[PDB]
Design a protein around this ligand. Structure first.
Ligand SMILES: [Mg+2]
Ligand SMILES: [Mg+2]
Ligand SMILES: [Mg+2]
Ligand SMILES: [Mg+2]
Ligand SMILES: [Mg+2]
Ligand SMILES: [Mg+2]
Ligand SMILES: [Mg+2]
Ligand SMILES: [Mg+2]
Ligand SMILES: [Mg+2]
Ligand SMILES: [Mg+2]
Ligand SMILES: [Mg+2]
Ligand SMILES: [Mg+2]
Ligand SMILES: [Mg+2]
Ligand SMILES: [Mg+2]
Ligand SMILES: [Mg+2]
Ligand SMILES: [Mg+2]
Ligand SMILES: [Mg+2]
Ligand SMILES: [Mg+2]
Ligand SMILES: [Mg+2]
Ligand SMILES: [Mg+2]
Ligand SMILES: [Mg+2]
Ligand SMILES: [Mg+2]
Ligand SMILES: [Mg+2]
Ligand SMILES: [Mg+2]
Ligand SMILES: [Mg+2]
Ligand SMILES: [Mg+2]
Ligand SMILES: [Mg+2]
Ligand SMILES: [Mg+2]
Ligand SMILES: [Mg+2]
Ligand SMILES: [Mg+2]
Ligand SMILES: [Mg+2]
Ligand SMILES: [Mg+2]
Ligand SMILES: [Mg+2]
Ligand SMILES: [Mg+2]
Ligand SMILES: [Mg+2]
Ligand SMILES: [Mg+2]
Ligand SMILES: [Mg+2]
Ligand SMILES: [Mg+2]
Ligand SMILES: [Mg+2]
Ligand SMILES: [Mg+2]
Ligand SMILES: [Mg+2]
Ligand SMILES: [Mg+2]
Ligand SMILES: [Mg+2]
Ligand SMILES: [Mg+2]
Ligand SMILES: [Mg+2]
Ligand SMILES: [Mg+2]
Ligand SMILES: [Mg+2]
Ligand SMILES: [Mg+2]
Ligand SMILES: [Mg+2]
Ligand SMILES: [Mg+2]
Ligand SMILES: [Mg+2]
Ligand SMILES: [Mg+2]
Ligand SMILES: [Mg+2]
Ligand SMILES: [Mg+2]
Ligand SMILES: [Mg+2]
Ligand SMILES: [Mg+2]
Ligand SMILES: [Mg+2]
Ligand SMILES: [Mg+2]
Ligand SMILES: [Mg+2]
Ligand SMILES: [Mg+2]
Ligand SMILES: [Mg+2]
Ligand SMILES: [Mg+2]
Ligand SMILES: [Mg+2]
Ligand SMILES: [Mg+2]
Ligand SMILES: [Mg+2]
Ligand SMILES: [Mg+2]
Ligand SMILES: [Mg+2]
Ligand SMILES: [Mg+2]
Ligand SMILES: [Mg+2]
Ligand SMILES: [Mg+2]
Ligand SMILES: [Mg+2]
Ligand SMILES: [Mg+2]
Ligand SMILES: [Mg+2]
Ligand SMILES: [Mg+2]
Ligand SMILES: [Mg+2]
Ligand SMILES: [Mg+2]
Ligand SMILES: [Mg+2]
Ligand SMILES: [Mg+2]
Ligand SMILES: [Mg+2]
Ligand SMILES: [Mg+2]
Ligand SMILES: [Mg+2]
Ligand SMILES: [Mg+2]
Ligand SMILES: [Mg+2]
Ligand SMILES: [Mg+2]
Ligand SMILES: [Mg+2]
Ligand SMILES: [Mg+2]
Ligand SMILES: [Mg+2]
Ligand SMILES: [Mg+2]
Ligand SMILES: [Mg+2]
Ligand SMILES: [Mg+2]
Ligand SMILES: [Mg+2]
Ligand SMILES: [Mg+2]
Ligand SMILES: [Mg+2]
Ligand SMILES: [Mg+2]
Ligand SMILES: [Mg+2]
Ligand SMILES: [Mg+2]
Ligand SMILES: [Mg+2]
Ligand SMILES: [Mg+2]
Ligand SMILES: [Mg+2]
Ligand SMILES: [Mg+2]
Ligand SMILES: [Mg+2]
Ligand SMILES: [Mg+2]
Ligand SMILES: [Mg+2]
Ligand SMILES: [Mg+2]
Ligand SMILES: [Mg+2]
Ligand SMILES: [Mg+2]
Ligand SMILES: [Mg+2]
Ligand SMILES: [Mg+2]
Ligand SMILES: [Mg+2]
Ligand SMILES: [Mg+2]
Ligand SMILES: [Mg+2]
Ligand SMILES: [Mg+2]
Ligand SMILES: [Mg+2]
Ligand SMILES: [Mg+2]
Ligand SMILES: [Mg+2]
Lengths: 46, 275
RNA sequence: GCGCGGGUAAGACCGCGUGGAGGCCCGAACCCACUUAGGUUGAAGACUGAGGGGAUGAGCUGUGGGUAGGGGUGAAAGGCCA
RNA sequence: GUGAGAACCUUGCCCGCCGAAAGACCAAGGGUUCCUGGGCCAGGCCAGUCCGCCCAGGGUGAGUCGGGACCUAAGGCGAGGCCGACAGGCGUAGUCGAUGGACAACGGGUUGAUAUUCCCGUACCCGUGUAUGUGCGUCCAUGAUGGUAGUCAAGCGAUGGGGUGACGCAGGAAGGUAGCCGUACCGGUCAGUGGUAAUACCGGGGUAAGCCUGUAGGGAGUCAGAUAGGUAAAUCCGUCUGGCAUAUAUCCUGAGAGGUGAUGCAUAGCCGAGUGAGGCGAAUUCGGUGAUCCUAUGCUGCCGAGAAAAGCCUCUAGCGAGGACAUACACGGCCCGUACCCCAAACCAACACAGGUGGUCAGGUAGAGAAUACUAAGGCGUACGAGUGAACUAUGGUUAAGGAACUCGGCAAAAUGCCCCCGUAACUUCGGGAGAAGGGGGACCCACAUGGCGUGUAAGCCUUUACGGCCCAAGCGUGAGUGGGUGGCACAAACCAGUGAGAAGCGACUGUUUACUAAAAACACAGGUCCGUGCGAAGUCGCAAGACGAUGUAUACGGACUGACGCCUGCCCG
RNA sequence: UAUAACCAUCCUAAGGUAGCGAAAUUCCUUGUCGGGUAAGUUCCGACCUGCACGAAUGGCGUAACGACUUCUCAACUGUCUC
RNA sequence: ACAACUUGGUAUUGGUGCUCGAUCGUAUUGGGCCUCUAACCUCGGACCGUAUAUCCGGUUCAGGGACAGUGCCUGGUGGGUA
């Protein structure tokens, strides 16, 4: 009787996987944040 | 000793276990143990380096002394024989006269309450050490050093032995456990005797858990494998693979020693199977 | 294995009390999905009602970590990778 | 009763349901759903005075609870550096990273919303100041010496050394405690019926941490000399010579019991007084049953053989003339989390959904039970209704005689089902096959019978006399057997609760697989043979360093085919 | 009367040792013989005429085990006449 | 076609000795073999950068050694990949 779905929330996991420090640690992250800023999104990175 | 189970459940029939009539304690010295972690058979990259190796049980490593030249000319006493999973054979605890404690492999036939000489001019008592230059011919040795100051890096498993042939200049001839003959500088160190617990061979396990605890994973045969992931795979029914056996990666059997190795033009001869 | 009474010269062996080794047995939770009736513009984008196998183990599960696409993983079915 | 409207809102009285939850809580998860006050054009599958609707205001109180300032793992970053055409991949020193280790508070009361946070009462752990008392040296000088002279043992004491800290699986016995069931004892009731007036019935029959004592039990060895092993030195840890020791010696630990905390708090009840508050306020002795909780990191067995750092103790190296102890007085003790929802209308599922969600609490009667049936504490009647012997559909219930004659198919149903006694085949790898089939008994009362058994007090015996060991009238609980009698169709009466046998084929067994049509004769599984590997191996990932194999060394490791065990495994090298 | 149960002809490398056989292999096939009820194209035990069994892509057995497949027996019942 | 493996030449690349030939002693410049150390190599031992370092670098001791590896050209195997 399994109904467990894909989404299992957790703030710690979400932050450390899609966090700013992780994003800017590398280069592609910097490029994508720059692209998003050029676009003009309200929130840069989740 | 060897003990054989009386069959009472289908899985256990024919099982056996080694009777540990040689142990005296079950607690290593707190100052000589060092930790170890379950490893999983991967590497830094995370790729599976060797298939079907993993799982098992948590083990604690104990340090051993394979140098045995820092201390010389000082006697020692045999204290106890201890359990050790990390290596096939058993081990012994030594009490040096000056008070230091050290660990070595337990040679065959040794027992509690004995005297071991580690001098460069020591006796021929088993368990002693002294340079190859000073060992008489015809004796059996183990823990051979591949070269001076290199540590015993050969013949460490249970039941192995090395036989010493004649000598020449700075070179000596050794009979390899597998029949080979190799030459090595006499300046190196070695130990007299052979590794005990020669009954390792007769152990019959008969149970999946006794292998899983050691960490052996299934093998999955080749023919059943699908054609994409394997060279024998495919075919309706079951067949020999439609091609002469080849490794699962494209390269067949045969020569395996890299030629022109620095030892290639110095070492004598190769093995012969089943003479 | 142990102690007692037999058998022996010693045994094997014969009975008597303790021990609970068992990938042992019946049976809850949990986990699995074999048969069967319903649902099928369903309550549910793969369930429910009866029955069905393990239950000291190759067991079940929480916590934090690693494995990236001609690649990963895979007790190996051309499965899985939101 | 409210209001214009009421089966769906408020009060009161009946009835039913749940109760290993349809109850009380934690972490994760959401953010204002919590309270007060306003209304009902939006929403609630219908109307709504109601709301998890919205409006406005209010509400979250820690030296001791969870985290940070304390320490670490699998892993991530990475100064130098290596390798790489560039971009970039590695990894040292270090710093990050709880699901762990250490670490100091409990009972009761309080408002519409807060409680180990406020108050009452009593505790514990770190720091600073003042005063006082023990009181030792710097400057005198006795001492021990290696005995004129040079050091010194006070007091601190490490970034250093050494101990401790520091670890698996299964299992019973013994002594305890919680919980529960009776009872001495204390307060209250006269329940419109045939009979019981207190020998009946109803309700009570409580109360923490710390501080004192140290019972049962368990564990452990101590002094003299030599020494040089522990990256220097060591009175420390080791090793070697001798003495001391089986003493319940000595030390440590330590359940439970006992006193203190408590002239206190709370409560059954009695008075007035009702959205409710105030005042007063009894007795609080003895037995049985008995844990999943304590002694316990105990003890006994087993192999597959079982984290680190910090802290604490100690040692010197080294600083050193003020410091140590005790008492009293007066002070300081940092940052974040703190409402509400938690087995769900507030989380995951597009919904106010028949699914899922880690952990803690576990009453009575029958019961082996945490299954099953009715029930206390506690919570619910969950959001469309009222009527009406159509067929038909779905879930149950019953049915003569035949019983498998339909159906590819004994599919579904039906049947046995529990406890105690008698005896159980062909087989066999001697464990098993085996609960094999079958037959008999199962209520109540009395007598045997004040029988027996366990516990256990009055009382007795004994002693290293104390919190002591033995028996144990009385009291309490409890099955087994033999006779006689009684009722009915039925004596495991409900619920719950295995069909069995005889063959063949396939697979040795337990196991795993196509989430979402296939659970197998499929897959692996322990046995064997061959091939390859001489050690920064072969085999790998990676154009490279490097990493695995292995902190291992052919009685091992990688690849291939086969699959327990028995009888075996023919010919042929083009 | 039944056929080869020895020798030689071609070829290449030799031309199936044990064991089993209308089977998870068999088109002609519901092959022939004995068992089973009244009826047996299923099943069981044998017959060798092996299209196209066969010993490490193993053969023949085998105690115990199987939500594996096929057949028979007693009890049962609304699976049926109904 | 490519990766990978593999064969020679050539540069890295040094000294001295035996042995085979094209204008039986006279002339031929390249092959085969044995030696020596300074190039080069060793996840060998010991010290220092260093208080903590199995990284790294340097000195020294000890072994290999003109090989191996690696640049450039080239001959072969090559469903491992396109
Ligand atoms: Mg270690
Ligand atoms: Mg990559
Ligand atoms: Mg493998
Ligand atoms: Mg694991
Ligand atoms: Mg060993
Ligand atoms: Mg086994
Ligand atoms: Mg395999
Ligand atoms: Mg397969
Ligand atoms: Mg292919
Ligand atoms: Mg793939
Ligand atoms: Mg195939
Ligand atoms: Mg085929
Ligand atoms: Mg095959
Ligand atoms: Mg091949
Ligand atoms: Mg070999
Ligand atoms: Mg037992
Ligand atoms: Mg059963
Ligand atoms: Mg519906
Ligand atoms: Mg969907
Ligand atoms: Mg279902
Ligand atoms: Mg179900
Ligand atoms: Mg059914
Ligand atoms: Mg079940
Ligand atoms: Mg079953
Ligand atoms: Mg079982
Ligand atoms: Mg299992
Ligand atoms: Mg990624
Ligand atoms: Mg398949
Ligand atoms: Mg998918
Ligand atoms: Mg109403
Ligand atoms: Mg219920
Ligand atoms: Mg319950
Ligand atoms: Mg339940
Ligand atoms: Mg949460
Ligand atoms: Mg939160
Ligand atoms: Mg509210
Ligand atoms: Mg309102
Ligand atoms: Mg409205
Ligand atoms: Mg609406
Ligand atoms: Mg509002
Ligand atoms: Mg606070
Ligand atoms: Mg690092
Ligand atoms: Mg840097
Ligand atoms: Mg790094
Ligand atoms: Mg960290
Ligand atoms: Mg943590
Ligand atoms: Mg509170
Ligand atoms: Mg263990
Ligand atoms: Mg244990
Ligand atoms: Mg009461
Ligand atoms: Mg206490
Ligand atoms: Mg000494
Ligand atoms: Mg218990
Ligand atoms: Mg303070
Ligand atoms: Mg804060
Ligand atoms: Mg709260
Ligand atoms: Mg809340
Ligand atoms: Mg809340
Ligand atoms: Mg809830
Ligand atoms: Mg939603
Ligand atoms: Mg709903
Ligand atoms: Mg739901
Ligand atoms: Mg769950
Ligand atoms: Mg329970
Ligand atoms: Mg009920
Ligand atoms: Mg309730
Ligand atoms: Mg109908
Ligand atoms: Mg029906
Ligand atoms: Mg009837
Ligand atoms: Mg009938
Ligand atoms: Mg018919
Ligand atoms: Mg039919
Ligand atoms: Mg059925
Ligand atoms: Mg049978
Ligand atoms: Mg039997
Ligand atoms: Mg039976
Ligand atoms: Mg007395
Ligand atoms: Mg006594
Ligand atoms: Mg009757
Ligand atoms: Mg067969
Ligand atoms: Mg099974
Ligand atoms: Mg399987
Ligand atoms: Mg699957
Ligand atoms: Mg499927
Ligand atoms: Mg599925
Ligand atoms: Mg299926
Ligand atoms: Mg399956
Ligand atoms: Mg199967
Ligand atoms: Mg299988
Ligand atoms: Mg074999
Ligand atoms: Mg094997
Ligand atoms: Mg092999
Ligand atoms: Mg290699
Ligand atoms: Mg093999
Ligand atoms: Mg087979
Ligand atoms: Mg097979
Ligand atoms: Mg041949
Ligand atoms: Mg040939
Ligand atoms: Mg046949
Ligand atoms: Mg067969
Ligand atoms: Mg045929
Ligand atoms: Mg046929
Ligand atoms: Mg036939
Ligand atoms: Mg039929
Ligand atoms: Mg064929
Ligand atoms: Mg074969
Ligand atoms: Mg063969
Ligand atoms: Mg069989
Ligand atoms: Mg029949
Ligand atoms: Mg009937
Ligand atoms: Mg060249
Ligand atoms: Mg060259
Ligand atoms: Mg040049
Ligand atoms: Mg080609
Ligand atoms: Mg292709």
């Amino acid at each position: 009787a399994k109904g467990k779905r894909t989404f299992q929330p957790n703030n710690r996991r979400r932050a450390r996987v899609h966090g700013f420090r992780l994003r800017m640690r590398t280069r592609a992250g910097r490029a994508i944040v720059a692209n998003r800023r050029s676009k003009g999104r309200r929130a840069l990175t989740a | 000793g060897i003990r054989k189970y009386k069959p009472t459940t289908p899985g256990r029939r024919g099982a056996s276990v080694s009777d540990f009539a040689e142990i005296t304690r079950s607690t290593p010295e707190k100052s000589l143990v060092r930790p170890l972690h379950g490893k999983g058979g991967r590497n830094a990259h995370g790729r599976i380096t060797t298939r079907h190796k993993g799982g098992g049980h948590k083990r604690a490593y104990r340090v051993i002394d394979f140098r045995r030249h820092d201390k010389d000319g000082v006697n020692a006493k045999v204290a106890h024989i201890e359990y050790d999973p990390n290596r096939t054979a058993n081990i012994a605890l030594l009490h040096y006269l000056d008070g230091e404690k050290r660990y070595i492999i337990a040679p065959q036939g040794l027992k509690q309450g004995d005297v071991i000489e580690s001098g460069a001019n020591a006796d021929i008592k088993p368990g002693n050490n002294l340079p190859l230059r000073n060992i008489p011919a015809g004796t059996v040795i183990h823990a051979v050093e591949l070269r001076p100051g290199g540590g015993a890096k050969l013949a460490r498993s249970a039941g192995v032995s090395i036989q010493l042939l004649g000598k020449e200049g700075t070179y000596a001839a050794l009979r390899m456990p597998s029949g080979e003959i190799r030459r090595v500088d006499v300046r190196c160190r070695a130990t007299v005797g052979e590794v005990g617990n020669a009954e390792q061979s007769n152990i019959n396990w008969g149970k999946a858990g006794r292998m899983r605890w050691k960490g052996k994973r299934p093998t999955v045969r080749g023919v059943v494998m699908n054609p994409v992931d394997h060279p024998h795979g495919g075919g309706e029914g079951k067949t020999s693979g439609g091609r002469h056996p080849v490794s699962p990666w494209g390269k067949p059997e045969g020569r395996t020693r890299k030629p022109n190795k620095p030892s290639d033009k110095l070492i004598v001869r190769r093995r012969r199977t089943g003479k």
